[PDB]
């Protein structure tokens, strides 16, 4: 690996900042660039950096020192849309591919002002049979761990009510397994104490 | 000024030949493949300019084929597909060449199967508002599973009365697998639409939960019992209830 970044991701509330790190193990690549890539698109030229110092672009800082080939990018006032996918690229002095750093994942996440953490059961449809168990309306910072061979548990879900000025966690569980419950759907999580558990 | 690729999705089985186009900005000089595993991991494939194939990285494989013929596009050929070639590819274009920003594609997802017996599309179902979230949050959340599809190539979108809604809405970034053990396993989805409380509480509000799949086409031949798991839409639907 070429280009080395850090952290591997990392997790900043909207408004906040954010701190990139990129180094070379090879001093031939001494031109630099901050790409960023969203889900399900192309990277995209954040700004290049290829002479010691500071640059700018909007909420935006590179600095680079080449004497030690450390490479940084700072983002400030951190905005939703600022969730993706950030990758460090250097190329030689001498046209040539890039060379990527593996990149480090950003979410920016919401603050949750009046948190009402519940675990809720929604009926299907068209069979009232099968269910699905919706946590929602956690703090961002709780931890939604994967868990058994036939019990599925998503990621947290980040929803935004625009015209509401309302955002909101959940993730979804399921399951046909005989023991499966709302109530023990989420277990091996760390859930608050005070998770309204409806029936 | 956007960098264009099609398709967004192939599948297809091994030993085959598959085209990856890419129309780059009007006036670049500079054209470069890349390809990304995993959905992190980017590598430099092959560039061109001057009308011929320059650097080459040892993942370029020189039996594949690049070329830019005079009004088309830049295309990358893939033969014989292996299922190593699975990866999302991406084009890009520069202006001034090496120094220069490189403008990226959207990316072609490239799935290559070892057969195509297994393509599955997803079922949906529609799953309604908890009653107890309504009393306690006067709010309503939608969820939406798309499950049992095979390969991983979908995208969701929530209708309501007819116009597509993105507003309330967010969908799983990725597909889960639905027994991990395999590496022929079939994929699950979720979605959530939360709406305020008194709209899914007017039955004249009408929500679709949609699905659309990348699949067979009719140039792929079928004689399986089951039907042609094509490339289509698959969808759930409810009306407002009080």
């Known amino acids: 690996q070429k280009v080395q970044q850090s952290p591997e991701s990392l997790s900043v509330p909207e408004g906040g900042m954010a701190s990139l790190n990129c180094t070379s193990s090879?001093?031939?690549?001494?031109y630099f660039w901050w790409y960023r890539q969203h889900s399900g698109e192309g990277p995209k030229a954040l700004m290049?950096?290829?002479?010691?110092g500071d640059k700018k672009e909007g909420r935006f800082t590179a600095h680079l020192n080449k004497a030690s080939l450390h490479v940084s990018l700072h983002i400030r006032d951190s905005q939703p849309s600022d969730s993706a996918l950030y990758f460090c690229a250097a190329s030689e002095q001498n046209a040539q591919g890039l060379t990527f750093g593996l990149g480090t994942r950003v979410s920016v996440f919401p603050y949750i002002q009046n948190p009402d953490p519940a675990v809720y059961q929604l009926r299907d449809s068209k069979s009232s049979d099968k269910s699905v168990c919706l946590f929602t309306d956690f703090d961002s910072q709780t931890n939604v761990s994967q868990s058994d061979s036939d019990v599925y548990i998503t990621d947290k879900c980040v929803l935004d009510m625009r015209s509401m000025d309302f955002k909101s966690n959940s993730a979804v569980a399921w399951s046909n397994k005989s023991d499966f419950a709302c109530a023990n759907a989420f277990n091996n999580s760390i859930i608050p104490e005070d998770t309204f558990f409806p029936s | 000024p956007k960098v264009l690729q099609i398709p967004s999705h192939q599948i297809i089985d091994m030993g085959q030949m598959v085209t990856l186009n890419c129309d780059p900005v009007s006036n670049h000089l500079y054209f470069y493949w890349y390809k990304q595993i995993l959905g992190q991991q980017m590598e430099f494939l092959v560039n061109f300019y001057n009308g011929k194939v320059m650097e080459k990285s040892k993942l370029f494989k020189d039996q594949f084929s690049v070329e830019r013929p005079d009004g088309s596009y830049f295309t990358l050929k893939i033969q014989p597909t292996a299922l190593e070639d699975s990866a999302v590819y991406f084009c890009a274009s520069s202006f001034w060449g090496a120094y220069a920003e490189q403008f990226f594609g959207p990316g072609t997802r490239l799935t290559v199967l070892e057969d195509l017996r297994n393509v599955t599309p997803p079922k949906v179902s529609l799953f309604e508002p908890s009653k107890a979230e309504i009393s306690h949050t006067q709010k309503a959340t939608l969820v939406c599973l798309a499950t049992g599809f095979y390969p991983d190539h979908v995208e969701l979108s929530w209708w309501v009365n007819g116009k597509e809604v993105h507003s309330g809405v967010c969908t799983d970034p990725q597909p889960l697998k639905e027994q991990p053990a395999l590496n022929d396993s079939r994929y699950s989805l979720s979605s959530r639409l939360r709406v305020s409380a008194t709209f899914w509480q007017n039955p004249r509000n009408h929500f679709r939960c949609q699905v659309q799949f990348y699949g067979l086409s009719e140039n792929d031949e079928w004689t399986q019992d089951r039907a042609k798991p094509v490339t289509q839409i698959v969808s759930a639907e409810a009306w407002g209830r009080a």
């Open positions: 290049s950096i290829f002479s010691d």
């Open positions: 090879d001093r031939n690549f001494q």
